Motif scaffolding. Sequence first.
Motif, PDB file in Angstrom:
ATOM      1  N   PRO A 379      76.549  11.374  23.486  1.00 57.35           N
ATOM      2  CA  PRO A 379      76.820  12.645  22.800  1.00 57.35           C
ATOM      3  C   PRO A 379      77.902  13.489  23.479  1.00 57.35           C
ATOM      4  O   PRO A 379      78.489  14.361  22.837  1.00 57.35           O
ATOM      5  CB  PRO A 379      75.463  13.363  22.835  1.00 57.35           C
ATOM      6  CG  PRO A 379      74.666  12.656  23.884  1.00 57.35           C
ATOM      7  CD  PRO A 379      75.126  11.237  23.836  1.00 57.35           C
ATOM      8  N   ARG A 383      80.628  13.752  19.161  1.00 56.63           N
ATOM      9  CA  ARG A 383      79.675  14.585  18.442  1.00 56.63           C
ATOM     10  C   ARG A 383      79.806  14.341  16.941  1.00 56.63           C
ATOM     11  O   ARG A 383      80.888  14.016  16.450  1.00 56.63           O
ATOM     12  CB  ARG A 383      79.893  16.063  18.776  1.00 56.63           C
ATOM     13  CG  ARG A 383      79.630  16.430  20.237  1.00 56.63           C
ATOM     14  CD  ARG A 383      78.133  16.604  20.502  1.00 56.63           C
ATOM     15  NE  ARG A 383      77.840  16.833  21.916  1.00 56.63           N
ATOM     16  CZ  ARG A 383      76.611  16.920  22.417  1.00 56.63           C
ATOM     17  NH1 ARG A 383      75.566  16.794  21.614  1.00 56.63           N
ATOM     18  NH2 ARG A 383      76.424  17.127  23.715  1.00 56.63           N
ATOM     19  N   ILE A 385      79.063  15.583  12.813  1.00 54.56           N
ATOM     20  CA  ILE A 385      78.797  16.646  11.849  1.00 54.56           C
ATOM     21  C   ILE A 385      78.686  16.049  10.450  1.00 54.56           C
ATOM     22  O   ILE A 385      79.579  15.329  10.006  1.00 54.56           O
ATOM     23  CB  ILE A 385      79.894  17.727  11.862  1.00 54.56           C
ATOM     24  CG1 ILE A 385      79.987  18.383  13.240  1.00 54.56           C
ATOM     25  CG2 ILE A 385      79.617  18.784  10.802  1.00 54.56           C
ATOM     26  CD1 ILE A 385      81.023  19.478  13.314  1.00 54.56           C
ATOM     27  N   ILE A 403      75.624  18.047  15.721  1.00 57.02           N
ATOM     28  CA  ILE A 403      75.758  19.471  15.993  1.00 57.02           C
ATOM     29  C   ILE A 403      76.131  20.225  14.721  1.00 57.02           C
ATOM     30  O   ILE A 403      76.717  21.306  14.775  1.00 57.02           O
ATOM     31  CB  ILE A 403      76.815  19.747  17.079  1.00 57.02           C
ATOM     32  CG1 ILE A 403      78.161  19.138  16.686  1.00 57.02           C
ATOM     33  CG2 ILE A 403      76.356  19.197  18.420  1.00 57.02           C
ATOM     34  CD1 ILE A 403      79.270  19.449  17.664  1.00 57.02           C
ATOM     35  N   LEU A 415      80.617  25.623   8.440  1.00 53.93           N
ATOM     36  CA  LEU A 415      80.903  24.613   9.454  1.00 53.93           C
ATOM     37  C   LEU A 415      82.397  24.358   9.600  1.00 53.93           C
ATOM     38  O   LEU A 415      82.922  24.343  10.712  1.00 53.93           O
ATOM     39  CB  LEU A 415      80.185  23.303   9.128  1.00 53.93           C
ATOM     40  CG  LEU A 415      78.714  23.216   9.536  1.00 53.93           C
ATOM     41  CD1 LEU A 415      78.133  21.867   9.148  1.00 53.93           C
ATOM     42  CD2 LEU A 415      78.560  23.457  11.030  1.00 53.93           C
ATOM     43  N   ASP A 418      84.200  26.857  11.713  1.00 51.25           N
ATOM     44  CA  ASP A 418      84.054  26.610  13.142  1.00 51.25           C
ATOM     45  C   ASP A 418      84.748  25.315  13.545  1.00 51.25           C
ATOM     46  O   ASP A 418      85.104  25.134  14.708  1.00 51.25           O
ATOM     47  CB  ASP A 418      82.576  26.565  13.538  1.00 51.25           C
ATOM     48  CG  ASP A 418      81.984  27.947  13.746  1.00 51.25           C
ATOM     49  OD1 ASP A 418      82.457  28.904  13.094  1.00 51.25           O
ATOM     50  OD2 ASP A 418      81.048  28.076  14.563  1.00 51.25           O
ATOM     51  N   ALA A 422      87.998  25.108  16.099  1.00 55.16           N
ATOM     52  CA  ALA A 422      87.777  24.268  17.271  1.00 55.16           C
ATOM     53  C   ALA A 422      88.856  23.201  17.422  1.00 55.16           C
ATOM     54  O   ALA A 422      89.219  22.835  18.540  1.00 55.16           O
ATOM     55  CB  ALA A 422      86.405  23.617  17.201  1.00 55.16           C
ATOM     56  N   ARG A 426      93.113  22.327  19.859  1.00 63.36           N
ATOM     57  CA  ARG A 426      93.516  21.074  20.486  1.00 63.36           C
ATOM     58  C   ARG A 426      94.900  20.621  20.025  1.00 63.36           C
ATOM     59  O   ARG A 426      95.428  19.625  20.522  1.00 63.36           O
ATOM     60  CB  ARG A 426      92.487  19.977  20.201  1.00 63.36           C
ATOM     61  CG  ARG A 426      91.129  20.219  20.840  1.00 63.36           C
ATOM     62  CD  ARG A 426      90.176  19.061  20.585  1.00 63.36           C
ATOM     63  NE  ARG A 426      88.904  19.243  21.279  1.00 63.36           N
ATOM     64  CZ  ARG A 426      87.898  18.376  21.239  1.00 63.36           C
ATOM     65  NH1 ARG A 426      88.008  17.258  20.536  1.00 63.36           N
ATOM     66  NH2 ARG A 426      86.780  18.629  21.906  1.00 63.36           N
ATOM     67  N   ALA A 446      84.855  16.080  23.753  1.00 65.67           N
ATOM     68  CA  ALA A 446      84.358  14.944  22.989  1.00 65.67           C
ATOM     69  C   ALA A 446      85.113  14.772  21.677  1.00 65.67           C
ATOM     70  O   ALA A 446      85.807  15.681  21.220  1.00 65.67           O
ATOM     71  CB  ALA A 446      82.869  15.101  22.720  1.00 65.67           C
TER      72      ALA A 446
ATOM     73  N   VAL B   2      83.153  21.654  22.208  1.00 62.69           N
ATOM     74  CA  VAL B   2      82.625  21.476  20.857  1.00 62.69           C
ATOM     75  C   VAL B   2      81.102  21.556  20.816  1.00 62.69           C
ATOM     76  O   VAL B   2      80.517  21.967  19.813  1.00 62.69           O
ATOM     77  CB  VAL B   2      83.061  20.119  20.256  1.00 62.69           C
ATOM     78  CG1 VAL B   2      84.429  20.231  19.599  1.00 62.69           C
ATOM     79  CG2 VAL B   2      83.058  19.036  21.327  1.00 62.69           C
ATOM     80  N   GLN B   3      80.472  21.167  21.917  1.00 64.93           N
ATOM     81  CA  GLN B   3      79.018  21.085  21.990  1.00 64.93           C
ATOM     82  C   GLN B   3      78.365  22.463  21.914  1.00 64.93           C
ATOM     83  O   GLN B   3      77.252  22.603  21.405  1.00 64.93           O
ATOM     84  CB  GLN B   3      78.602  20.369  23.279  1.00 64.93           C
ATOM     85  CG  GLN B   3      79.458  19.145  23.593  1.00 64.93           C
ATOM     86  CD  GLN B   3      78.997  18.391  24.828  1.00 64.93           C
ATOM     87  OE1 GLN B   3      79.194  17.180  24.939  1.00 64.93           O
ATOM     88  NE2 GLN B   3      78.380  19.103  25.765  1.00 64.93           N
ATOM     89  N   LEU B   5      80.189  25.335  20.765  1.00 67.37           N
ATOM     90  CA  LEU B   5      80.851  26.148  19.751  1.00 67.37           C
ATOM     91  C   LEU B   5      80.065  26.233  18.442  1.00 67.37           C
ATOM     92  O   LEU B   5      79.887  27.320  17.892  1.00 67.37           O
ATOM     93  CB  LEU B   5      82.258  25.603  19.482  1.00 67.37           C
ATOM     94  CG  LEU B   5      83.238  26.473  18.684  1.00 67.37           C
ATOM     95  CD1 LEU B   5      83.117  26.251  17.179  1.00 67.37           C
ATOM     96  CD2 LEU B   5      83.049  27.947  19.025  1.00 67.37           C
ATOM     97  N   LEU B   6      79.600  25.093  17.940  1.00 66.60           N
ATOM     98  CA  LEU B   6      79.006  25.052  16.607  1.00 66.60           C
ATOM     99  C   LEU B   6      77.504  25.335  16.606  1.00 66.60           C
ATOM    100  O   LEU B   6      76.907  25.524  15.545  1.00 66.60           O
ATOM    101  CB  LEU B   6      79.288  23.701  15.946  1.00 66.60           C
ATOM    102  CG  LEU B   6      80.768  23.464  15.618  1.00 66.60           C
ATOM    103  CD1 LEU B   6      81.452  22.635  16.698  1.00 66.60           C
ATOM    104  CD2 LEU B   6      80.937  22.827  14.250  1.00 66.60           C
ATOM    105  N   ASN B   7      76.901  25.368  17.792  1.00 66.30           N
ATOM    106  CA  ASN B   7      75.504  25.773  17.932  1.00 66.30           C
ATOM    107  C   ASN B   7      75.164  26.161  19.368  1.00 66.30           C
ATOM    108  O   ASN B   7      74.813  27.309  19.646  1.00 66.30           O
ATOM    109  CB  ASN B   7      74.560  24.665  17.451  1.00 66.30           C
ATOM    110  CG  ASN B   7      74.782  23.345  18.171  1.00 66.30           C
ATOM    111  OD1 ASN B   7      75.559  23.263  19.123  1.00 66.30           O
ATOM    112  ND2 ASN B   7      74.089  22.304  17.720  1.00 66.30           N
TER     113      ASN B   7
END
Lengths: 555, 7
Positions: A379, A383, A385, A403, A415, A418, A422, A426, A446, B2-3, B5-7
Amino acid sequence: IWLPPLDVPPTLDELLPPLSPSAAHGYTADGWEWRGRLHAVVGLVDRPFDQRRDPYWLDLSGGAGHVGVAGGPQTGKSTMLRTLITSLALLHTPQEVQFYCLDFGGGTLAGLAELPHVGSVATRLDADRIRRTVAEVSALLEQREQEFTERGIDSMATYRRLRATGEYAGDGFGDVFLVVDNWLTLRQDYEALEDSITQLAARGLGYGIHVVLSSNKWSEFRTSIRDLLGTKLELRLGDPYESEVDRKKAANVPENRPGRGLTRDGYHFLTALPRIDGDTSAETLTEGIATTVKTIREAWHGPTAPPVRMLPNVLPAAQLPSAAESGTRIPIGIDEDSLSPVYLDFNTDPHFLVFGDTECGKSNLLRLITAGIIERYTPQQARLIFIDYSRSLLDVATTEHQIGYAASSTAASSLVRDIKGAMEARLPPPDLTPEQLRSRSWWTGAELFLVVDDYEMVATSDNPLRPLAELLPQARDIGLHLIIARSMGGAGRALYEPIIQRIKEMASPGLVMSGNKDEGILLGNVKPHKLPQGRGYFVERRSGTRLIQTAYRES
Amino acid sequence: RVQALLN
Ligand SMILES: Nc1ncnc2c1ncn2[C@@H]1O[C@H](COP(=O)(O)OP(=O)(O)OP(=O)(O)O)[C@@H](O)[C@H]1O
Ligand SMILES: Nc1ncnc2c1ncn2[C@@H]1O[C@H](COP(=O)(O)OP(=O)(O)OP(=O)(O)O)[C@@H](O)[C@H]1O
Ligand SMILES: [Mg+2]
Ligand SMILES: [Mg+2]
């Protein structure tokens, strides 16, 4: 000069020694010095100024290994094929000769299917078996081209001599015969199999692979393969001007007396009946054969001819290579060409796209790939989604990787917002060394796998995923991955919407499943048609388009 | 991250 027309054709027992049950060579000429030397009698022949007809024999060891048969409608083409196969079966064992038939001429080769020498017979219908039968032999040719060189096999004769010992396993085969009844029907409905079979005839005779091809006219064979047919058996021809022996000699060939034909030397021959009982009549032909095939089957208590490995209806996902042997590569199924695994590599190509109709196996494939990612990535490395309005990916969304889970249009927008923020962070700065771009240095973290099922219903007027379209071609630098599945309903006009447009533009991998041809081409060169559950055309612009069968994950 | 950020 020529003998007067015969009134009854010969049978195989007439043209062969006293046949006996052997232990264990089957029902054959027990102990004959001519048994198993790949010679075969196919009838009687009348050479000029002979006063008694001699037995017509064919030598299939060497250059004359390939057999061609021509002739007009109802001239006796299909019966000649059945006679050659039976004759070889009477003088050989199933471990010495094998037959694989593509019957496009009356479907009459089915009667010889129960022969232990025969491993496959395909009607006009069984396209899956037809396409696979050729590929099976084609793979055997390539196998022997390396088997013989890695060992001390200089010639095919040496190979037979080794298996004659009875202490040599070999590649599990002997001399393999690929039989086609109507070459025209093949190259018309299977254009790809025309060139492939031709390649088999080219270099396959030295490796024990034979082609026995039949057709209405010689002109129906391309020059590339027609010249490869060493042994040519020509029956009564319509338009004898394209005869391979002589035009004027062919025009005087008896009509309405099937079995009558000419050799390349101009000899008059008559095809024998595939019987061993002695009945010279032809109205009792369906039943002659049965008894003969039965006798051959009964006398043989050993291994039969290897079958054509078909694509499974349901392919267990447990069969595919584990993460320990595949690495980051994710196997999703096997291809029809060689039954070898078909991998996905997200380090080579970021995205992936699926098209398929109702209940073809779209959601199952997504659960497979996701489970494959989970199995291969920690993980902290990757990750997940999920955008899943229909809630079909529940089994794989309980992992620590997950996540995000959007089951509603609102949850999707919350979602992607975000997500867009995110991933934009990058985006590579203007001034960067190529090594910094290659190693992805300026950001640590990740990979992000966005799995979308039933994209058809998330792609409304206000598609919540559209804000990601502008950074989709930048995926390789930011570590983004879109895995999308869609239906066939309006899939054609769905190739121009912002996302699929750019995903397809990147030459992303994907496959098409059981779609309607009304939708036109979607990926690569394949126009969709009804396919079985789990099957699809795996389009990849590195390895072209290949028909594969995807795996099934339980629950 | 990322881990986070979304929760
Ligand atoms: N040597 C023979 N003696 C008597 N009758 C024969 C002989 N060979 C074939 N026949 C008869 O001719 C008929 C047609 O034979 P065959 O199927 O070989 O022709 P074909 O070329 O396959 O016809 P099509 O082009 O329709 O497939 C058969 O029903 C068979 O009974
Ligand atoms: N790889 C496979 N091989 C064989 N059968 C399969 C495979 N995947 C799914 N199936 C069968 O197809 C049926 C439907 O599977 P699945 O739900 O994955 O398709 P779908 O595209 O999600 O259907 P829908 O359009 O209703 O969502 C299942 O009952 C399953 O038995
Ligand atoms: Mg026929
Ligand atoms: Mg579904």
